[PDB]
Curated annotation (Swiss-Prot):
Tissue expression as described in the entry: Expressed in a number of tissues. Abundant in thymus.
Similarity comment: Belongs to the DNA polymerase type-X family.
Superkingdom classification of source: Eukaryota
Cell compartment(s), UniProt: Nucleus
Lineage: Eukaryota, Metazoa, Chordata, Craniata, Vertebrata
Protein name, UniProt field: DNA-directed DNA/RNA polymerase mu
Functional description taken from the UniProt entry: Gap-filling polymerase involved in repair of DNA double-strand breaks by non-homologous end joining (NHEJ). Participates in immunoglobulin (Ig) light chain gene rearrangement in V(D)J recombination.
Gene source species: Homo sapiens
Note in the entry: DPOLM has a reduced ability to distinguish dNTP and rNTP as substrates, and elongates them on DNA primer strand with a similar efficiency. It is able to polymerize nucleotides on RNA primer strands.
Amino acid sequence: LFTQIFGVGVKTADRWYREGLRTLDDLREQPQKLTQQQKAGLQHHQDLSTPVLRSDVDALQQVVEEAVGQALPGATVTLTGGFRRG
DNA sequence: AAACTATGCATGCTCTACTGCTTCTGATCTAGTCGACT
């Protein structure tokens, strides 16, 4: 559960385990030891938990192409990662 | 002629500014360690 939080790794999860935080609520109880990455991950935990579908991938690519063109014309963007693997 | 008073001056003391030199302190750049991510 802890590892699914953006900005929280194995070491941080183990540290929280040894500190007595056994559920997600305790993390939100004290939002002062969480860095920017952890705060962002916890704020939108539910949205990022849902798997990303191909439709979102195509929408993101279409949006990013316009930004890349505006920054500069003639640039190319390629989709890599798991999606490129099918 | 003698006693009292007057001015006059000097030197040490005190303060406030002024300038220049020396030392201390606060702001700004990187190595290492832990952690995050792809």
